[PDB]
Amino acid sequence: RQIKDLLRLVNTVVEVRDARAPFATSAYGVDFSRKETIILLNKVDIADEKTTKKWVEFFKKQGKRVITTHKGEPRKVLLKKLSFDRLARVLIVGVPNTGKSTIINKLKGKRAGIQWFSLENGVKILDTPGILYKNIFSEDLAAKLLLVGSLPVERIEDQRIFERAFEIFARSIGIESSFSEFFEDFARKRGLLKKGGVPDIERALMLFFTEVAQGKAGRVSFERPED
Numbered sequence: 271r272q273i274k275d276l277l278r279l280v281n282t283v284v285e286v287r288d289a290r291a292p293f294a295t296s297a298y299g300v301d302f303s304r305k306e307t308i309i310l311l312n313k314v315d316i317a318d319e320k321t322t323k324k325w326v327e328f329f330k331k332q333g334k335r336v337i338t339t340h341k342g343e344p345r346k347v348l349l350k351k352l353s354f355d356r357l358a359r360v361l362i363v364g365v366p367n368t369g370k371s372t373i374i375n376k377l378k379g380k381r382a383g384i385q386w387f388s389l390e391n392g393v394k395i396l397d398t399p400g401i402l403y404k405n406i407f408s409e410d411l412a413a414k415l416l417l418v419g420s421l422p423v424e425r426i427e428d429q430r431i432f433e434r435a436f437e438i439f440a441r442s443i444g445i446e447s448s449f450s451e452f453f454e455d456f457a458r459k460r461g462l463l464k465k466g467g468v469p470d471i472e473r474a475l476m477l478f479f480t481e482v483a484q485g486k487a488g489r490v491s492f493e494r495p496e497d
């Protein structure tokens with residue numbers, strides 16, 4: 271209902287998280303306690319390498335099965351990292367925009383009611399990923415889903431979420447300047463002005479957060495295990 275329907279069909283789950291925020295992009299709530307579970311930390315190419323290294327050992331130390339990967343990693347390498355049992359049947363699960371379609375497409379690759387596809391050794395993978403929508407109870411979670419592009423900028427009505435998101439960004443990257451200074455500067459630098467040469471702060475926020483989520487603002491992670 272409806273990930274609960276799909277879980278019934280599988281014995282293996284691949285949890286596709288964003289490496290920049292492994293906790294905000296975890297599939298909390300939904301139950302994989304009786305499935306073989308691989309934690310996939312994705313988008314390592316746009317994450318802070320050192321932070322990602324900390325996340326790996328954090329999961330390994332917990333006894334958990336964890337891998338890291340990104341768009342540009344070869345299909346062969348991903349498959350080896352995955353190392354699926356020959357009798358695995360697989361659900362790819364996660365929050366929106368975390369790289370699940372891209373992963374399915376690479377595995378697929380492409381070759382040929384709920385649909386499946388098969389790997390060369392016959393392991394079966396569900397063609398469509400289970401999409402997980404979270405109760406956003408904290409503005410911190412909303413901010414973190416914004417930063418990784420799970421929560422699109424068009425959906426943000428509350429300016430406090432933008433502020434929390436910046437505050438997380440700023441701490442991660444080392445910025446000590448204020449919300450106002452930073453966004454005025456960003457609007458200026460990118461020529462985002464309205465009549466009278468007034469910095470368009472709203473366009474600024476929209477472009478900046480779009481760019482952060484795409485990894486265009488640098489290799490930055492938003493959660494640390496330390497923490």
Ligand SMILES: Nc1nc2c(ncn2[C@@H]2O[C@H](COP(=O)(O)OP(=O)(O)O)[C@@H](O)[C@H]2O)c(=O)[nH]1
Pocket residue numbers: 312313314315316339340341342364365366367368369370371372373399484485
């Ligand atoms: N930099 C980077 N971008 C990625 C990676 N995987 C996916 N993306 C991008 O993330 C966005 C969402 O990817 P998509 O596969 O459609 O996400 P989905 O909603 O989970 O299926 C797209 O803009 C992709 O181009 C990755 O490993 N690295």
